[PDB]
Structure formats: C-alpha cells, structure tokens
C-alpha cells in the first residue's frame, strides 16, 4: 500500500523492464506483452531526466529523439542506484558552484549548511516521523534531541573546516551508539569502510553505497562535477557525492542498518528496505534541493 | 613514484579497440558484452573485449541493454550514439550533434585537472591561451606525422614536403598573431583546406572539395567524416579519464555542445585521420578497412596518450 | 495547496501518475507532500489528470477522490463514500423524526448567525476592504433574528424568519457599500451586479457544501431545513451556513469596486479559504449528527 | 402529468453507449470528449457522444483529465476505474473491488427513492424482503430471455428449454423458503452454476468450469468477466440516476463494497450477459465483438429501464 502522494520536484523518471524504441517518430515503451502500462505518460520535454534501470534497453532512434528533445538519459542499478553511466549535462549551477568554491570561506558557509540540513533530517526521521519508531527503532527521544542540539551548537562554534569535520564525526559516533542501544545491538564500533564484518558495519557500508548512487544522480542532473566538494578534502575522488550522501546517511541509512541487523535481514532485505526509505522520505529530492539552495545563496 | 591511479591512466591510454556498430544489439551473453546481428536465420555474436576498448559508437539500427551499460561503465568504456552515413545524430537550432555520449558516473575521477580547468575556464582570455595551446600542439603533430612519418611515406602519401612545411610555418605565424577565438577558428579552417588539397595531390585523388555535415558521397569526404568519429571517441575518453566535463570547450564552444571533445579531437584530425582518409580512398578500402587502418595509426602514434598529456599541459599551464 | 486539515487536499495543474513504485504528482512548469491513508480525501481541479494506475493505488489505500472546478468548486464527480465513524446511520437515525430535524435546523441557524456576527463585525478583513457596515444595526439584526428564530414553532416559521434575516442583511449590505436601492431577484432573473454576484457566489458555495456532505458520506436528499422534496436540499442547507456571512458582503463589495465576474470569483475563493468555510461546514455537520442521539 | 425530470430519466435510460477503454487518454478536444490512442505516426481520436453514453470504464494504461470529468459529469456519465484482464482493480483482505466509480455530484438527484431506501435499509428483515424481490425479478428475466427471446434462439443458443424451466422452478421454490440472506446467496450461486452448464451445452462449449477473480483464460470465463463490467456500469447508472448510494446493498453487502451495484447487476447477468458470453465463445468473437453484441442485447431488452423500474418497485414496496 502506498502511504504518500509525492509532490514531485526534480523531473526525473525511473524505468525498468521495458524496451525504449521509436515507432513512427514517436518514443514508445514496450514489454513482452505489448505497450508498457505507465511509461507513455512520462513527459518528454527538455526538463526531463530518464533513468533506465533493471531490464531496460534503448535503441539509437530513441536516443536521437530523446537527445533532440533535451531529455537527459542515464543508466542505473535497481531502484535508481548506483548511477552507471549518463549523458553529460550542457554547461545554471556549475557557474555558481565555481563562483564560490575557490573561496575557502564560502566553502565553509556551504559545509555548515550541509550539516544543518543533515541535523534536521536526523531530527525529522528519528523523532517527528513515526515509521522508523513503528518498525522497532526505539530511540531515546530525549537523548537524541540532546545530541542534535549539542552537536548543532558544537558545529556552529567550529572555526574552520578541520574543526567542522571533527564535530561532524563526533555526532556520527554518538548516533551509532544511540542506534545500537535503540536496537539492543550491544557493543558497536564503526569499522572504517569495508573492514568490518559484523551485520551493522556491513549494512552501513552497503547502505552508504546505495546513497552514493542517489547523490551522483543529484550532482548529474544539476551539472555539478564530483570533484568540487564542500566538506571532503579537495583531493578526494567523488568528494561532492560523499557530501551529498552525508545529508541522509545518519537519518535513513543508519537506523535501517541496525534494524535489518536486529531483524536478521539478508543483504537483499536490507537493500530493499533501504530503497524504500530513500523513496518514501524523498531523499533524492532533498539532495537536489540542498544543492540548489546552496548554489543560490553563494552569489 | 607513480600512483596506482596514474598507472591505470597509462594503461587505459593503451587500449586499442574502438567499435563502430550498426544494425546490431549490444547485450550481455554468458557474462560477456557482445553485439548480435541478425543473419536471416542465423544470429551472429561478436565479442567485445571491454578491458581493451575505449569506446563504442552506436549508429543506425542499434540498441543496447542496461546490463551491457553496467559492464561497460564499470570497465570505463564510453558509449556514444551517432547518426548514419557520417551525418549528425540530430540538429537543433544551428548546432549539429554528431554523437550523444554516455559517460561512466561511478568510477570516481581524479579531481586535480577538473579543479585547474574550472579555475581558468570562466575567464575568456585564459580560454584563449588554452585554445592557442591546443592549436600549437596540433601543428606540431601535423609536422611530425606529415614530414617525419616514414610509415605514412611508405604507404604512398607522396606529399609535397616543402609545400607542407610552408603552410605549417604560415599557420604558426598566424596562430600566434590571433587576437581572439574568431581569428583562431579562421586560421584553422584555412590550414585544413590547404591540407586537404595537399593530401588530394599526394594520393592522386583529383580535385577535392570538402563537403559539410556528412553530405559528401565521395570516398575522401566519407572517410574524413567516419574518421572524425574515431577522433571524437578518443577525445571523449581523454577528457573523461582526466575528469574534465566535455562541455568546458576552449575553442569550439560556440558551434558545438560538449565542445571540448572537438577541441581535443583536433589534436589528431589533421595530423593522422586526414592522410589516411586519402590513402584509403586511393587504395579502394571499404569503410571498415579505413577504420581499421586508422586505429592502427592512432595506436602506433599513441594518439590517446598525446591527447591526455596535452590536456594535462593545458590545465597545468593555467596555474 | 490542499489547505483543509490533515485530511482534504486540493491539486491543480498537475498530472497524477505512478513512477518507480510511487504515486506522484507532477506540476506544470508554470506553478507539499500528501499522506495516502484511509482518512485522506483528494480533489483534482483545474488542469489536472490522473492515470488508472494512480487511481488504483489511491483506491486501494482508501483515499476518496473527486474532481472539482477552480479552487474546489463546483464538485463535478467523486468516489462513493463507503456506507458505515459514519454519519449516515446517525443522520438517518434522526432525520425521520420531524422534531429532531427541527433541532438540527435550529442549530444550523444559530451557526449561520454566529458566522455573520464574526465576519461582519469581529473580524476586520471585510471592514478593511470598505465593507462599512453599521456595526450597531448589524448586532441588533442578529440578536433580533436569533430571538425570533428561537421563538418559531416549526420548520415553516423557522424558514420565514430565516428569509426575513436575509432580507435585512441585503439592505444593511447595500447601505454599507453605497449601492443604492437593492431588491433580491429570485432565480437568476436579476441583471444588476449585486444580484448577479449573489447568484454566482451561491453557486460557488454549493460546490463547497457538496464537498462537505461527500466527505461525510451524507446524501444530498436528507435536508434539515429545506423541504423533503427539494433536490440538493442538504447542500443548500450547508451552503446557507456561510452565504450571508461571506458571499453576501463580497457581492456588494465586488459591485462597488466594479469587479468583473472573475474578480468576484477569486475574491470568494479567498474569503472562503481565509475563513476556513469548508471546515466549518464539516464541523457543523458532524456536531449535528453528534447532538442528534 | 409526467414530470420533466422523469422524462429525463426515461431519456437517460435509453442511452446505448458504454465504453471499455484501455491504453488511451480521455480528454477534451475542441469542446468534445474523446479518447486518444497512439498509433506510431498518427494518433487516433475517437469521439465519445456523451449524451448517448451511460458510463466509461477505464482499464490498463488509461488516464483522464479534469476537463473531461467536467463534461462527463455534466452529462450524467459515470466513470469507473477497473483492473486488467477482468481481474479486480484491487483486493483489500477478503474483499475484491472490480470497479472504482466516480459519480456526478452536481447534477442533483430526486430525493424520493433515497428517502424510501434509507427508510427500510437499516432493518435487516426489510433488506431481506428487498433481496427476495430482486431475486424474483432476476428469475423472471432468465425465463423471458432463455425461453421466449427468439433473437437468442436464432443466434444459436439451442438451450434445453425444459431443463432451464425446471431449474428456474426449483430456484423460485428454494428462493421463497430462504430463511436468511445466507440461504439466498447459496441458492443464487447454485442456480448460476446450473445456468453455466446449460449455456455451455446449448453452445457446444464442452465441459465448463467457472473461474473466480478474472483468473480464467478460456473464452467463456473471459467473456463472463468482461460482460459483468457492462452490467456493473448499467447498475451504477440505474442507482445513481435514482439517487440511491451504491453502498446500500440488500444482498451482496458482506462480500462487496458498493454492493447495491452487484445486487442490481444480478438482474441481467444470468439472463442476458451469460448466454451472450457462450454465443461469443462459440462464434470465435474477439472481446470487442462480444461487448458490442451485449450492448445490442441490453439495449434491445431495455435492460437499464428494467433495473430502474425494479429499484423503484423495491423502494415502493418497502413502504408497506
Ligand atoms: Ca605520456
Ligand atoms: Ca419502464
Ligand atoms: Mn565523511
Ligand atoms: Mn576544428
Ligand atoms: Mn434557501
Ligand atoms: Mn450475485
Ligand atoms: Na555522407
Ligand atoms: Na483473465
């Protein structure tokens, strides 16, 4: 059962299990049993973005007709992640992004706002919205709000990027501990990526991977290159994708990791639970909006 | 000494295969990427060695699947959809789009060249310096390949060497005199026209007239259009592998989308593709013979590596 | 915008569809999330469309769906409400006892009088717009009618008094706006702008009333004040809750300002939205059903 | 004498069109309501004569616009959303919803039938008397149609007349003695099952087995599922035109939302839809051929008029 009628923001559609082709100058979508039931109703304007996921194919004639119409096209894994390969976006956000990015102070302004955005999404999904709680995420509501409020303040006071990052890490650590307790996980230590074998560290690694796919889709639709991070160091590959994934990491991935663990989920149960959370909470939209908002303010 | 990344870049720069496909389906078969043609009853199946491939050009009557895209992206192979007969995929306003490129998005790129690039790119006079630098590099390749390339000589490129030296020397003087981008573009077309003429005479083509937008029917024009796709693919690869978006053109930005691909393809279009278009015409090659001959020359001359070095030099020389 | 408590949403200029497993609504490039639960109601207005796959998902999730004009009126067509937290049994439970029906009717009249007092006097929006009504004459009128309504012994007398209050509000409204002589023209037969705007305004009010009865599952044919044989009777009863408080002054204001049809229309819609008219209609209907037992 | 409103009801009862639409958009084009399919190079545009239409059923791959809803609603045309391939739009627990109906809300209905209806409806025993009444009206349509409709006979419905007459007599008997709604429901399904068998034999279908929830792939089952939508549409129209809410069911209330639609559709399902489903299977009709043949039968037999009279009769009899 659906529970949300989604006010769509970014004009991005996901397709799966169909063949995209052209009949008489018209882009159509075909399955083994004739015309696809939904896809004919995706609007083919220069504001559209198309992601072709599981069991899709496309012909050259369709590609022509989509590119002619200003439709950006990409290929993604199941559920829109990872983002495999995509059309380059014509160079708008890039100009603005570059406009502030070389001013280290404006970069910190961007980084501070990302953290505020991230703090709010934690507050929202762990407390205000009930779904996680309903599914057994029994977090100490009181200790959570303290954590957010302390960190928020501690973040506001960091004088520079190095300090912001330190505080940013401390908050994540605090959340792991609360999440573990919430779910009676017992001892938890975050293992640096790939190196932990326990279910939670695993689900966290896999979850972050699904989120990087959504973040990459956000930077791609906006024409913003991965190498212009606001929080991660300037030499980190994929740096901005990670900044962008960090927006919903602790609010959506973190709690489902400990839940799947608590519940004895296998890898695919976790992946699917995760995608459903990202979907319901409109994560991709938020990543996009955060990016626009930051660019808009910069100058 | 060298990073593992830089090693991988060198290794990528040595991939020799570049496919141009028509009337086939690109898909995955027993975990291999393959293209499939319909031979009436037969279907023929052709392997694609992805670790050795820089790009796929997919023209008329092609399709590709998401599972192939997955495998291709993961191996860092670009996929471009192009039009038929060397004509544009489509034309919108006054701009022709030869290839729609799909570039891998999850194989994270280095950041340093991108940062240098967006560092100069919004400054018009610094784009001028970058444009000029590409043009200089282009002239040095024309000289080397037209004058010191025994392999081209031995294949029947009986070019008037004195005349080639004179045109290239005049172009250099003009290039360095150019006040702006319009002057660069003007000089470039002017060299190209002299070179087509010289190549025509070298190969007994008879009187040659360059036809635009893939409109020419004659062997030379067709081979020149087909060969440019090869240069576009290497250029699309060279910029992708360094993390530079195709859109940040410094010379062709007014008349081409993803114009950096054209800027970079110009490094080898006149030096390498052009002679071989006339050599193939002269000998009666079919298109795919000509394509193989180019790939051989581009591998031999280490074209991809040159393109990548030049991008680096251009990026470094705005610091 | 979808303004009306956690439960009724209004959409316009968008396509409702299913993509990537979600029910989504896609706004026109020219122009908040909605919860899909069994308590949701959804109205699709100007420049909307919906696919069968979306309808499926909303129906499955217990969302009642309707189509309506600009701003939520008229109500064109809607899902049948499941007969049951159900007002229908209660409604019918009192409706056949004529004395209980009068109790309902008396409550509607008190509710309507309070709305008039609120909007004409207490609340100043109307005032600010140039509705310069004699505050004193208005309070006398309301108090007198209230008293006269409580004194009426049956529906007939209640209806008589009810019309006599409307007549005296028209006159107060005309003077408030320096309109000059006014006489209510019955049945769309009036040509002067106040008469025309009152006709149009009531039509917009019917649209809202129809929505209120639809959400509660109550049939139009069970009126508490209008005659048993009158088609759309309960809708007219419900519209009467806000006719004189909101539509009547806007009609004289629009005429005074030289408004065209659409100015008037948009002014009502805004008044109706500002004053939360639809919620009042619904609350009143719920309360009458509650106080009927 | 005859009121303009009742004349309008008689006029509405004669509307002959009923559309079942798939893979198209319903919209307004030059002031007309039309449906549009995409045919590669050319879109096809099909007019909907709204004054001559009872309902639209919109299945797989449809959409409709507010502007179309406005024109349809104004003309008193119902719009239902149905599922694919004769299967339910959806199922929520033990209850299947075949069609989600949108009914016009600004074309004010008469009040008298509704008032009679809510007057008896909350009394179970009165609902029972209403259910029996519907069931007798159904037996009478079955008799008239299977025994006296020469048109069906000439189309090759070679039914065993005596076998049919005997089953309907047994049914009437069992009907009158039904103590509960439970008993009525049991007898209803027992008669329908005899009728499938008789229709199958009249049309050389071979052994027939009714499949539920649209799950049957054989022609008869598919036409039965398809024909039911037509009956639902006319029932939805009959009840709406009289101002009776779909939910005030007297028979199928336990298993069906908007159950009165089913109770009313039962007046013509076995009498008309059922033989035609077997005739179409016998001839090799495509689905749209079958649907047209039904519409022709329903119009010739004045099915909508009968449903409407029956609801009126039932409402008027509750009143004693
Ligand atoms: Ca090198
Ligand atoms: Ca009759
Ligand atoms: Mn980090
Ligand atoms: Mn050039
Ligand atoms: Mn009245
Ligand atoms: Mn039945
Ligand atoms: Na050509
Ligand atoms: Na079926």
Curated annotation (Swiss-Prot), chain B:
Disulphide bonds in the chain: none
Co-factor binding details: Mn(2+) supports cleavage of ss- and dsDNA, while Mg(2+) only supports digestion of dsDNA in vitro.
Cofactors (names): Mn(2+); Mg(2+)
Keyword Cytoplasm: no
Regulation of activity: Inhibited by EDTA.
Lineage: superkingdom: Bacteria
InterPro entries documented for this protein: Cas1 (IPR050646), CRISPR-assoc_Cas1 (IPR002729), CRISPR-assoc_Cas1_C (IPR042206), CRISPR-assoc_Cas1_N (IPR042211), CRISPR-assoc_Cas1_YPEST-subtyp (IPR019857)
Annotated effect of mutating residue 221 to A: Slight decrease in endonuclease activity
Record flagged with keyword DNA repair: no
GO biological process: defense response to virus; maintenance of CRISPR repeat elements
Keywords: Antiviral defense, DNA-binding, Endonuclease, Hydrolase, Magnesium, Manganese, Metal-binding, Nuclease
Positions of Mn(2+) binding: 188, 252, 266
Molecular-function GO terms, alphabetical: DNA binding; DNA endonuclease activity; identical protein binding; metal ion binding
Pfam family of the protein (one): Cas_Cas1
EC category: hydrolase
Subunit composition and interactions: Homodimer. This bacteria does not encode Cas2; Cas1 must interact with a different protein to insert spacers.
Similarity section: Belongs to the CRISPR-associated endonuclease Cas1 family.
PANTHER family assigned: CRISPR-ASSOCIATED ENDONUCLEASE CAS1, CRISPR-ASSOCIATED ENDONUCLEASE CAS1 1
Free-text function comment from the UniProt entry: CRISPR (clustered regularly interspaced short palindromic repeat), is an adaptive immune system that provides protection against mobile genetic elements (viruses, transposable elements and conjugative plasmids). CRISPR clusters contain sequences complementary to antecedent mobile elements and target invading nucleic acids. CRISPR clusters are transcribed and processed into CRISPR RNA (crRNA). Involved in the integration of spacer DNA into the CRISPR cassette. Acts as a ss- and dsDNA-specific endonuclease.
HAMAP family membership: Cas1
Name of the protein in its database record: CRISPR-associated endonuclease Cas1
Organism listed in the record: Pseudomonas aeruginosa (strain UCBPP-PA14)
